[PDB]
Design a protein around this nucleic acid. Structure first.
Ligand code: NI
Ligand SMILES: [Zn+2]
Length: 703
DNA sequence: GTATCCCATTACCAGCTGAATTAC
DNA sequence: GTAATTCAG
RNA sequence: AUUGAUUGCCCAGUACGCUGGGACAGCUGGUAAUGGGAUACCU
């Protein structure tokens, strides 16, 4: 069938058509398959984003489901076998094959005979088992090839995979809109009483938030509606306006220009504990009755879940026609959702042709010149060069590349400057990490007994003074001689060590012996040597309390997410600005190929001074890996063209002169040694050189 | 400067994420 | 009327 | 029927009644790495 497909290069075929093409080819013949492929409609995309839904109620715990018990059993049996044994035991797709499988194997199904369901289990388990062999083979083949070039110039799985607890739905258990009339055995919690929703009616029930009365859930407070005109719905009284205190920085409602998501129930906004939500029960009941419920029935077990997750996601991607119904909403997604028992969610995937995105891979460095040649052949293309750095989190420059042979110049191109808001967000993220650590430690300290508490609190406040006293004692020196407020640990400083070297100080006391060579004790090393230590029992208690609090803390996940949305927001803003500056919307993103696995994660930062040696180091990890992944994943998640070029000798070569030297870079300032022209090291030189490398076919020469 | 625990995160790479028709 | 067959790069 | 698109998740404000934004390719598994904090070595 592949040869027949190869004669349609311009037309893209969906997976359904290819699977349907095989049936036609085996049924009628090549004339039929060509005729069918001629009549196939062109697909607008092939990416299938997932949507997550909240599970409402379940008949049994997911561990007790027949599908879960058989799935875990089959997975364990497969992962306990060898390659030769698995090939002979893996069954076919027929019903008789499954029964034969359970007969030859001592393993027994738990009254689960669904052919489609067991077909998914066997197919997925073998794929996971074969994944380890593929993973090892590619690693070995790459390692052997890499070592060969440098030199010239099994049984039971060693690392068996874990059990995949996800339940994969099939056509037999396809999601249907829940009606209590047709599901008598299905129960529901108390808030889900009197549930009623006709599947075929439109879900387009839209209402204005400004009409809610002042004593009802969702009401927009008066002080947030002071800019609404008199003739509009949300206008506030003139007498009541005099009670508005200014400067409170409370939000202002967007009564006319608001676009995007509409929030209906706000019980989840009040996730604090100082004051519980006033309408918690009322909003819970109302949201329960306004839920859109779908049901998956596997055997005698059922899952009821919200498909409001589908609805919001569909309106986000602008994929719904007028008057969409629950049945149509479920038709927008494939009828094979995945159930996650641990997270308590049911995941839906879009159908292939719904989302107009063609996922693409990263263009390699040697294909940079070829890729732009095709892009410039079919109209123009906008170059987007992004440089990742520490002082500048990302520097972006947009180039309108009408012809591949055109010259790229700072006057020709435009620079996309990093916003101050994103710098503030990065600083706030780091501060939130530091405050989370401080709060966790403080709560753990407060969890201890009074004697341990007072001991720990006493140690922290006078930790620096006692250490300084120990230094001035063991090292006889004037405390005023050493500048304690300029002492540092990141840079090797020996202010105390050098002073002790005078007056015939002992070499052994000031120097530390190491296997490689003798190393002089740094000032931070001196402070840590004489730093007072807690008692063993108190230290153990504090460590146990800290670990217990951290294990159950839910803030680390929130911070990791917050970083993810921060990086993605920066990337989205950069893409939007690239579209805005150069009117053409065919953006190609040029990245520098970075090994973000290591050597790009920043260290912690410590404030200058001796007193800061005894406090926890502040978080200062760089955002380079986050921005690299967020930019690189644009190709797979959104279909954009992303190119990774060789980063060597970028920002070190003069944009005007070919001279290359390491001395050209002085940090955030670029000055060439041959010519006096000066530019910004990252914003101007780096982006321009990256764009030139992308347009050209070879990495730049150095030194 | 090195070494061992503890907590958190990640990077890389290996999977996975139907349905029309027929059978009965 | 739910469940088994049958396609794929 | 709405200016706006009903659940969920993240951030900042709040009079705690909400507003203004943000992400929307996700999951499972294994390995490795990094960051932070203690402790051990040494005069
Ligand atoms: Ni750079
Ligand atoms: Zn020059």
């Amino acid at each position: 069938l592949t040869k027949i497909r190869r004669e349609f290069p311009n037309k893209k075929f969906s997976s359904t058509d290819m699977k349907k093409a095989g049936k036609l080819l085996k049924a009628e013949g090549p004339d039929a398959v060509r005729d069918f492929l001629n009549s196939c409609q062109e697909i607008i995309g092939d990416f299938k984003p997932p949507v997550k839904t909240n599970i409402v109620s379940i008949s049994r715990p997911f561990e007790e489901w027949p599908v879960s018990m058989v799935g875990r059993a089959i997975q364990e049996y497969y992962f306990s076998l060898t390659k030769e044994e698995l090939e002979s035991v893996h069954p076919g797709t027929s019903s008789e094959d499954h029964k034969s499988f359970f007969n030859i194997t001592g393993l027994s199904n738990y009254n689960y005979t669904s052919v489609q369901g067991l077909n998914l289990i066997f197919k997925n388990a073998k794929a996971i088992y074969d994944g380890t062999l593929v993973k090892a083979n590619n690693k070995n083949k790459k390692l052997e090839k890499k070592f060969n070039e440098i030199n010239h110039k099994n049984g039971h799985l060693n690392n068996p995979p874990g059990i995949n607890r996800n339940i994969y739905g099939y056509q037999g258990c396809a999601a249907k809109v829940f009606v209590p009339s047709k599901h008598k055995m299905v129960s529901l919690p108390k808030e889900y009483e009197g549930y009623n929703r006709d599947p075929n009616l439109s879900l387009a029930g839209f209402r204005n938030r400004l009409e809610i009365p002042e004593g009802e859930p969702g009401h927009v407070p008066w002080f947030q509606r002071m800019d609404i005109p008199e003739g509009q719905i949300g206008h506030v009284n003139k007498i009541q306006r005099f009670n508005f205190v200014h400067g409170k920085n409370s939000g202002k409602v967007k009564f006319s220009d608001k676009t995007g998501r509409v929030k209906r129930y706000h019980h989840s906004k009040y996730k604090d504990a100082t004051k519980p939500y006033k309408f918690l029960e009322e909003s819970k009941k109302v949201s329960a009755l306004d839920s859109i419920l779908a049901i998956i029935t596997i055997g005698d077990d059922w899952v009821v879940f919200d498909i409001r997750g589908l609805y919001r996601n569909v309106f986000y991607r602008e994929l719904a026609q007028k008057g969409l119904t629950a049945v149509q909403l479920l038709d927008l997604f494939t009828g094979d959702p995945v159930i996650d028992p641990k997270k308590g969610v049911v995941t839906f995937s879009y159908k292939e042709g719904v989302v107009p995105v063609f996922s693409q891979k990263i263009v390699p460095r040697f294909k940079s010149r070829d890729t732009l040649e095709k892009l410039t052949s079919q109209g123009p293309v906008a170059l987007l060069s992004v440089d990742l750095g520490q002082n500048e989190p990302v520097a972006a420059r947009v180039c309108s590349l009408k012809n591949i042979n055109d010259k790229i110049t700072l006057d020709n191109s435009c620079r996309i400057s990093f916003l101050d808001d994103y710098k503030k967000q990065i600083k706030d993220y780091r501060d939130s990490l530091d405050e989370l650590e401080i709060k966790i430690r403080l709560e753990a300290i407060n969890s201890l007994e009074t004697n341990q508490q007072v001991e720990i609190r006493d140690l922290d406040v006078f930790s620096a003074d006692r250490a300084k006293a120990n230094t001035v004692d063991m090292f006889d020196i004037d405390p005023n001689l050493i500048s304690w407020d300029s002492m540092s640990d990141a840079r090797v400083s020996t202010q105390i060590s050098d002073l002790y070297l005078k007056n015939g100080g002992d070499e052994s006391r000031v120097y530390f012996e190491i296997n490689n060579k003798r190393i002089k004790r740094s000032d931070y090393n001196i402070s840590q040597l004489v730093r007072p230590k807690l008692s063993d029992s108190t230290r153990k208690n504090l460590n146990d309390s800290i670990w217990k609090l951290k294990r159950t803390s839910e803030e680390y996940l929130k911070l990791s997410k917050r970083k993810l949305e921060l990086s993605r927001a920066v990337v989205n803003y950069t893409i939007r600005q690239s579209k805005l500056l150069s009117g053409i919307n065919d953006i190609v993103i040029i990245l520098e190929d970075l090994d973000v696995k290591k050597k790009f994660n920043g260290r912690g930062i410590r404030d200058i001074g001796w007193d800061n040696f005894f406090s926890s180091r502040k978080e200062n990890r760089w955002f380079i890996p986050a921005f690299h992944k967020a930019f690189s994943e644009l190709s797979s998640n959104r279909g954009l063209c992303v190119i990774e070029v060789n980063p060597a000798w970028t920002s070190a070569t003069c944009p005007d002169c070919g001279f290359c030297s390491k001395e050209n870079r002085d940090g955030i300032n670029f000055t060439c040694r041959k010519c006096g022209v000066s530019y910004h090291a990252d914003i101007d030189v780096a982006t321009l050189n990256i764009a030139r490398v992308a347009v050209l076919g070879k990495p730049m020469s150095g030194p």
